[PDB]
Design an enzyme around this catalytic site. Structure first.
Site, PDB file in Angstrom:
ATOM      1  N   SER A  61       0.874  -1.156   0.000  1.00  0.00           N
ATOM      2  CA  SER A  61       0.000   0.000   0.000  1.00  0.00           C
ATOM      3  C   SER A  61       0.915   1.210   0.000  1.00  0.00           C
ATOM      4  O   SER A  61       2.038   1.124   0.502  1.00  0.00           O
ATOM      5  CB  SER A  61      -0.862   0.009   1.261  1.00  0.00           C
ATOM      6  N   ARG A  62       0.458   2.328  -0.556  1.00  0.00           N
ATOM      7  CA  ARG A  62       1.261   3.545  -0.512  1.00  0.00           C
ATOM      8  C   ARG A  62       1.230   4.202   0.875  1.00  0.00           C
ATOM      9  O   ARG A  62       0.160   4.442   1.446  1.00  0.00           O
ATOM     10  CB  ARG A  62       0.887   4.533  -1.618  1.00  0.00           C
TER      11      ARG A  62
END
Lengths: 263, 128, 47, 43
Positions: free
Chosen positions: B117-118
């Protein structure tokens, strides 16, 4: 699987085949050497066993298990470990020595409390009397005073067979003066001590030389089996590889032909 | 409509594999030539233009947001496949699920090593 | 109690030195089979 | 015949994953020994 998955897997197993083949040959030349060295060592070690096998000797117990650190040698380690725990449950205060790290790996979860000392660096250079001496010295000058003891190891029989055996160590310098050893009575305690020590080294030397021959032969076999299994996989994967290879060309080409016809 | 009127929405596209198949049928029957795997030449664009619409808006535009969870079905674990690779390359991150893990008892069957995930706003929480 | 036993040394140790000296007195013909014997591979395991 | 070093790791296969864990095990045991030796060199 995908063409890329097959290709990568094929390359891996080909590498595994080459290595297991090479290590089979290493073990074969090492086994040949061990079996030569075992010849005089058997005469020597059995000669050191003559005293107890010509007299009825009876009586804190010491179990010495002998294998190596090295994997891929079949049931070499499980065998010795199986008789170690088996004889331990039958005995009545028990302390355990393991020679070869694989002994400690198998027994630690249940017998960690009972471990006196462990030895490693077993199975790389053919054992010597020095190695027997090093184990010997780190037991006498360690702190544990055992009444009886036994050493458990793999006795060599042939390229494919070995037997897990147990030899006694009555090394308790108190038990050397009993019922049947009554005829050996003029010796002062000083020399009996020197004798007792030397014979302790002899019996461990004997186990070291037998174990190594068994271990190298079993290593040869395991590597031979590994490389035969790898070759069978290689054969099967190569067939899948070629099928898949052709099918990718076919599939690609039908796509381009469809693309051309649609214009 | 939520994004642009100061509110927050979450959208799930379940799933984009089946949308690409329908796009492929329609396009072929319109007589637009078949591309890679018979998909239209612009199947990437079909998905890239959609997912680019998920956005976080600044305050001058209302502070609203739209978050997207697209869903892609792989075949026999093949993430290197055409449509899967397109969407992986578009998204900010991905949650990879695996059959091996599922049957081993790992449920939810997330591959933590591969799943990304960012960063996270500083704010995911603070005690979390 | 020999001079070496009073020093805390064992017959194992005594015998090892004696054995080494007999090897160190061989000539370059039998000395080749020093190597293959007289090793110090095995090591103790603490902690 | 054709060069192929590192193919086992490259496959991400069981043998590949096992070897990675085996190296890690070895070097974590080394680190323990080296950090203690560094502690006792500290004084």
């Amino acid at each position: 699987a995908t063409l890329k998955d097959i290709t990568r897997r094929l390359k891996s197993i080909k590498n595994i085949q080459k290595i297991t083949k090479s290590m089979k040959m290493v073990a074969a030349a090492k086994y040949a050497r061990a079996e030569r060295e075992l010849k005089p060592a058997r005469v020597y070690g059995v000669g050191s066993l003559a005293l107890y096998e010509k007299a009825d000797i009876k009586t804190k117990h010491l179990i010495i298990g002998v294998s190596s650190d090295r994997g891929l040698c079949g049931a070499i380690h499980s065998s010795v470990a199986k008789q170690m725990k088996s004889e331990a449950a039958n005995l009545k205060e028990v302390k355990i020595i393991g020679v070869g790290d694989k002994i400690r790996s198998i027994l630690h979860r249940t017998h960690s409390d009972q471990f006196l000392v462990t030895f490693k660096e077993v199975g790389r250079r053919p054992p010597t009397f020095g190695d027997a001496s090093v184990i010997a010295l780190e037991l006498l000058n360690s702190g544990y005073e055992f009444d009886e003891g036994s050493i458990i190891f793999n006795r060599f029989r042939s390229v494919i067979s070995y037997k897990t055996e147990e030899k006694p160590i009555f090394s308790l310098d108190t038990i050397s003066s009993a019922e049947s050893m009554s005829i050996y009575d003029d010796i002062d305690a000083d020399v009996l001590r020197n004798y007792q020590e030397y014979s302790l080294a002899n019996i461990i030397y004997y186990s070291l030389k037998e174990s190594t021959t068994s271990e190298q032969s079993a290593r040869m076999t395991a590597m031979d089996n590994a490389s035969k299994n790898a070759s069978e996989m290689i054969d099967k994967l190569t067939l899948t590889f070629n099928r898949t290879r052709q099918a990718v060309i076919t599939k690609e080409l039908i796509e381009i032909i469809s693309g051309a016809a649609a214009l | 409509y939520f994004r642009d009127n100061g509110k927050h929405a979450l959208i799930i596209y379940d799933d984009l594999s089946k949308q690409a198949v329908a796009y492929r049928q329609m396009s072929l029957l319109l007589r637009r030539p078949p591309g890679r795997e018979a998909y239209p030449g612009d199947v990437f664009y079909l998905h890239s233009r959609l997912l680019e619409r998920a956005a976080k808006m600044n305050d001058a535009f209302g502070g609203g947001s739209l978050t997207a969870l697209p869903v892609i079905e792989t075949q026999a674990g093949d993430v290197s496949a055409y449509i899967p690779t397109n969407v992986i390359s578009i998204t900010d991150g991905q949650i990879f699920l695996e059959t091996e893990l599922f049957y081993k008892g790992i449920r939810p069957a997330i591959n933590v090593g591969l799943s990304v995930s960012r960063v996270g706003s500083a704010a995911q929480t603070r005690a979390m | 109690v020999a001079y070496w036993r009073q020093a805390g040394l064992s017959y194992i140790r005594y015998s090892q030195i004696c054995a080494k000296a007999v090897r160190d007195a061989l000539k370059t013909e039998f000395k080749a089979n020093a190597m293959k014997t007289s090793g110090s591979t095995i090591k103790i395991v603490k902690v | 015949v054709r060069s192929s070093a590192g193919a086992v790791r490259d496959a991400g296969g069981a043998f590949g994953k096992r070897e990675q864990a085996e190296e890690e095990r070895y070097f974590r045991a080394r680190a323990k020994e080296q950090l203690a030796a560094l502690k006792k060199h500290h004084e």
